[PDB]
Design a protein around this ligand. Structure first.
Ligand SMILES: [Zn+2]
Ligand SMILES: [Zn+2]
Length: 56
């Protein structure tokens, strides 16, 4: 059964252009408007001084 909504309306992964992001959203806390899907957050490097907040 579908028990949680996991689509993030209006949110594109900047790493892979997933749209909309399905699953956990990782928003950069330093960039104004930068987001990763989970695969990209675990897979792609960003700015080493930047940190992501998880939005599930
Ligand atoms: Zn992605
Ligand atoms: Zn950033």
């Amino acid at each position: 059964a579908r028990t949680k909504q996991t689509i993030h309306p209006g949110v594109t992964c900047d790493g892979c252009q997933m749209f909309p992001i399905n699953g956990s959203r990782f928003k950069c806390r330093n960039c104004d408007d930068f987001d990763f899907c989970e695969t990209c957050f675990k897979t792609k490097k960003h700015n080493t001084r930047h940190t992501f907040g998880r939005i599930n």
